[PDB]
Design a protein around this ligand. Structure first.
Ligand SMILES: [Ca+2]
Ligand SMILES: [Ca+2]
Ligand SMILES: [Ca+2]
Ligand SMILES: [Ca+2]
Ligand SMILES: [Ca+2]
Ligand SMILES: [Ca+2]
Length: 1019
């Protein structure tokens, strides 16, 4: 088949993020969302709010010699065509006033079609040609598109993805006079018309690649011509065509009325807004409300994408599937449904809560950073507020039925308890630690969950949740309120602390080119969330001293009112020259933050109307509230104004929601989404008692000796609950003491003890217990023993961390089908050389029954054992040298090694059968620690020990840097031992029994080879 020139078509980008307007029908039958920019129609989403398919659709007019695009006419306007519907009207006038184009957008509520009502007026003597320019980017990619023709329509498809196939059909109410398909940059309509003012291409096909279509619209005799276009979408070309035709069959006027009617009814059925809202503030309210509703998907009701846009889209390539802002974030959704809840749309919230827990929630209980409308995980960062908000949504809505609690809510709440107070990522999705913003949601979510659990008769989980929430609520100031900050009085909440000591002045890189700055120096308004979520009283003094420094550090006065930056030094925004963000830049003013300040003001009985005025001063002529507005007096080359959209991303469903929600709060006289049961506990009047709680056993970290562990202590509380990994059991309190043998249910058990006072006050205590099975017996050994007979030295290289070869203990456990031999060292369990669990350690455990006398150990060992042995367990993660061997070097069984750094342990799983009948419960054993080494470095994979002075001398360099010293002998490459003297043991330390010393037992000067004692495990 013959193709128009240009294949595969030019590289393409997306569209300006600042949309002049957006729209979709209220009816879910129409899976179409349109956006506008630069006087053209930009991305049109379908069939999900998360899939863009278009780049630009506009008109070109020619005089037969010269041709023009409306996107280049300096004079063009945008205005919403109906104060109660998302229908916009763009107007384009020739720079020489020869013609005028008027376009009004709407969509067919019954089917997937975007419709355009157009009026073309020739104000000259006449003789003009009009053409539609449609450059699609089907299925979220500018390439892989194929355009064709059929029955006077312009077809196009991209069925590369079997999951979401996309096809379109462009149809003229008066048909086309001439059509053409082409490759962008070579044979597309504008490239053609620009050249000679004539559409020379007539190809009825093009692609696959980056193509575009153009169709001449026949004009009517006289000054103007009225017509409409129908851009239909379907899974295939036939469907798309049929659908677009049906729309034209009904007609623009009819469809238009129907589209506008649905919205008018929706608004009119919802709660009437505050009467104190001026005309403009009311229209803003209405448009912001419809916009938030428009961010809800139609295929997956209850799912809300963040924004029908792509930030700095003109610089975002469109060749590969991109996420942009058109995806589902639990946080923004929270903002959206909470705003719809404020307006009266209960259904949307119920669907929302259902979708969140059914589709986005991960099996472990937490919510992914991002997801597709169908729940397919997108970004995988861990933001604790995204697991908290859905919980708070379920709390506000009453979704608390026993089933939803057990299988949905509880796993989410358990995750928060297990995750601890530090969040890996806060709401700006950049850094972790104690976040004021996120901890606020963590506390409120847990306190709500406690009431939800209590309602469902689960008193144990309720106490764990409340105790935890209470403990974090009373630590808010200790962890994030600095008293020595380099701003104002030095007293204020900082954005986030890594260690939880707001005065340590710890530093970190804050990304986007901001560089390193102490946490003490970064201010962030996220602390206002404390009163917003009922975690602190509206008049909380800590939150109050933060205002001054925070306002001085990141706020400023725009002509529309005071606005705030996200945080100090934030660089997520345009560059100094006004150029878009490309990894680095300088963050600007975020209008939604004015709304947040408004809720804080409102909560304190102040007039929040001005904040609404500020948010609206940031909107464009279409009432779209941007994510950011310029903050400088001067206008870079890119005309930028103080307090107006930078042009990067608008609307933001979140900012649109903040406007509606604050406005609803103004009518109520208080923020309406604040969790009442939470505020009743932390922001109300009387304080609760703080019971005393002391857990004497176990210690912070311990290893059980069975499947149960003793949890005991003292308390002056009425009740005490002990919960292990989500399963709680009550501990009867007697005379201010308690003691419960709780059941362990995993390798690692997170134990939480919650005490409850008669008035409801709580205290909490966390403990971690490692489980390996029933302890058979144990052996102990002192620390700082890692020096052989007391004169050996680790090889100088850094990899050999202190205490690496220092054994502190050996515990054996019956672990079902295996024996768990757990070795404990004073040093840190490291694994740099990439071995199995470990790299440097090679411990030997000779097992026997105490028969006979002196018996040599493994080869490169250079030691004898007290009595004979039937087998040895070699724990070496290097070179696959681990397993159980017979005295003849044969490996009789494979073993598994596991490193548990937190406990400085090294676990070796040995299948019971590996010990042919030899029961570790009554067996004698010798334990020695050696340094692993390659075969060519010493026989038996044992790093040898050389003479003291020789080693100290350092010559060659690798001797003192990669070998042990303080023993005897120098290197020798001729023999397998590589040591000219093997009389001295190669063990850095062993275990001995009562009456003996490692100094004497390892004293080769008194006898060689040395004889390591054979001892038994103590129950
Ligand atoms: Ca494509
Ligand atoms: Ca294209
Ligand atoms: Ca779930
Ligand atoms: Ca030791
Ligand atoms: Ca030696
Ligand atoms: Ca020792």
């Amino acid at each position: 088949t013959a193709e128009p020139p240009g294949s595969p078509g030019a590289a393409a980008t997306w569209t300006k993020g600042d949309k002049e307007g957006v729209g979709t029908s209220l009816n879910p039958a129409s899976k179409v969302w349109y956006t506008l920019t630069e006087g053209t129609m930009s991305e049109v989403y379908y069939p999900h709010a998360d899939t863009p398919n278009t780049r630009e659709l506009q008109f070109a007019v020619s005089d037969g010699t010269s041709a023009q695009r409306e996107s280049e006419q300096t004079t063009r306007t945008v205005e919403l065509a109906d104060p109660k519907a998302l229908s916009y009207r763009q107007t384009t006038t020739d720079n020489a006033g020869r013609w005028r184009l008027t376009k009004t957008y709407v969509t067919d509520p019954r089917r997937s079609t975007v419709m355009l009502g157009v009026t073309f007026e020739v104000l000259d003597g006449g003789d003009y040609q009009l053409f539609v320019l449609s450059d699609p980017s089907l299925a979220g990619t500018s390439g892989g598109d194929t355009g064709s023709v059929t029955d006077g329509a312009l077809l196009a498809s991209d069925l590369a993805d079997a999951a979401t196939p996309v096809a379109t059909a462009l149809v003229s109410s008066v048909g086309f006079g001439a059509v053409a398909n082409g490759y962008v940059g070579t044979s597309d309509g504008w490239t053609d018309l620009a050249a000679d003012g004539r559409l020379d291409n007539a190809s009825a096909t093009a692609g696959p690649g980056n193509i575009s279509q153009t169709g001449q619209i026949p004009l009517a005799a006289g000054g103007k011509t009225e017509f409409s276009l129908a851009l239909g979408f379907g899974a295939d070309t036939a469907e798309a065509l049929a659908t677009a035709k049906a729309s034209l069959g009904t007609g623009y006027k009819k469809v238009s009325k129907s589209y506008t009617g649905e919205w008018k009814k929706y608004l009119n059925s919802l709660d009437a807004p505050a009467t104190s809202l001026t005309g403009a503030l009311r229209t803003q309210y209405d448009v912001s409300l419809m916009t938030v509703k428009s961010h809800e998907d139609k295929t997956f009701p209850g799912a809300f994408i963040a924004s029908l846009t792509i930030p700095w889209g003109q610089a975002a390539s469109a060749e590969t599937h991109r996420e942009g802002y058109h995806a589902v974030w639990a946080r923004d959704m929270y903002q959206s449904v909470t705003a719809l809840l404020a307006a009266g749309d209960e259904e949307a919230a119920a669907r929302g809560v259902e979708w969140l827990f059914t589709y986005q929630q991960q099996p472990d209980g937490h919510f992914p950073q991002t997801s597709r409308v169908d729940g397919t995980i997108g970004q995988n960062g861990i933001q604790l507020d995204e697991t908290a908000f859905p919980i708070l949504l379920a709390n506000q809505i009453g979704r608390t039925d026993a089933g939803f609690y057990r299988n949905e809510l509880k796993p989410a709440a358990d995750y928060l308890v297990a995750a601890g107070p530090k969040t890996p990522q806060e709401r700006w999705e950049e850094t972790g630690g104690y976040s004021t913003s996120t901890l606020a949601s963590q506390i409120a979510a847990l306190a709500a969950a406690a009431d939800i659990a209590g309602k469902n008769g689960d008193a144990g989980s309720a106490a764990v949740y409340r105790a935890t929430a209470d403990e974090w609520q009373r630590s808010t100031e200790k962890w994030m309120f600095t008293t020595n900050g380099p701003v104002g009085d030095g007293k204020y909440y900082l954005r986030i602390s890594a260690t939880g000591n707001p005065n340590d002045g710890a530093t970190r890189d804050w990304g986007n080119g901001a560089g390193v700055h102490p946490e003490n120096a970064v201010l962030d308004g996220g602390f206002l969330e404390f009163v917003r979520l009922g975690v602190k009283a509206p008049a909380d003094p800590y939150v109050a001293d933060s205002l001054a420094e925070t306002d001085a550090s990141i706020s400023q006065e725009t002509p529309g009112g005071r606005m705030w930056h996200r945080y100090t030094y934030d660089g997520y925004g345009e560059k100094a020259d006004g150029s878009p963000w490309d990894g680095t830049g300088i963050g600007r003013l975020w209008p939604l933050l004015s709304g947040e300040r408004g809720e804080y003001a409102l909560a304190n009985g102040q007039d929040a109307l001005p904040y609404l005025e500020t948010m609206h001063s940031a909107a464009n002529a279409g009432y779209m509230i941007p994510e950011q507005v310029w903050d400088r007096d001067e206008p870079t080359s890119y005309g930028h104004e103080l307090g107006r959209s930078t042009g990067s991303a608008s609307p933001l469903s979140w900012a649109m929601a903040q406007y509606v929600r604050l406005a609803a709060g103004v009518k109520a006289g208080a923020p309406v989404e604040t969790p009442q049961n939470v505020a009743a506990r932390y922001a109300a009047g009387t304080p609760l008692s703080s019971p005393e709680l002391s857990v004497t056993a176990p210690e912070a970290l311990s290893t059980a000796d069975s499947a149960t562990a003793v949890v005991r202590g003292t308390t002056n509380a009425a009740k005490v609950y002990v919960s292990v990994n989500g399963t709680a059991t009550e501990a009867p309190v007697t005379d201010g003491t308690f003691s419960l043998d709780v059941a362990l249910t995993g390798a690692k058990n997170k134990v939480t003890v919650a005490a409850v006072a008669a008035d409801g006050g709580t205290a909490v205590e966390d403990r971690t217990v490692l489980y390996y099975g029933s302890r058979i017996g144990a052996l102990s050994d002192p620390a700082g023993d890692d020096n052989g007979p007391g004169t050996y030295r680790y090889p100088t290289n850094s990899a050999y961390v202190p205490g690496a070869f220092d054994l502190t203990g050996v515990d054996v456990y019956d672990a079902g089908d295996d024996y768990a031999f757990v070795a404990t060292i004073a040093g840190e369990v490291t694994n740099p050389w990439g071995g199995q669990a470990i790299s440097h350690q090679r411990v030997n455990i000779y097992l026997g029954k105490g028969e006979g006398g002196a018996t040599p150990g493994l080869p490169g060992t250079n030691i004898n054992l007290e009595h004979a042995w039937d087998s040895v367990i070699v724990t070496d993660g290097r070179f696959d040298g681990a397993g159980v061997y017979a005295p003849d070097g044969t490996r009789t069984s494979a073993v598994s090694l596991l490193a548990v750094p937190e406990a400085r342990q090294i676990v070796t799983r040995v299948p019971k059968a590996a010990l042919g009948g030899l029961d570790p419960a009554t067996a004698r054993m010798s334990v020695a620690m050696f340094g692993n080494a390659e075969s060519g470095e010493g026989i038996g994979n044992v790093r040898p020990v050389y003479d003291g002075a020789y080693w100290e001398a350092g010559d060659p360099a690798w001797i003192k840097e990669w070998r042990f010293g303080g023993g005897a002998g120098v290197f020798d490459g001729t023999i397998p031992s590589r040591d000219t003297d093997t009389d001295d043991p190669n063990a850095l330390d062993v275990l001995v029994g009562e009456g003996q010393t490692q100094a004497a037992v390892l004293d080769w000067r008194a006898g060689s080879p040395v004889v390591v004692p054979m001892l038994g495990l103590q129950p």
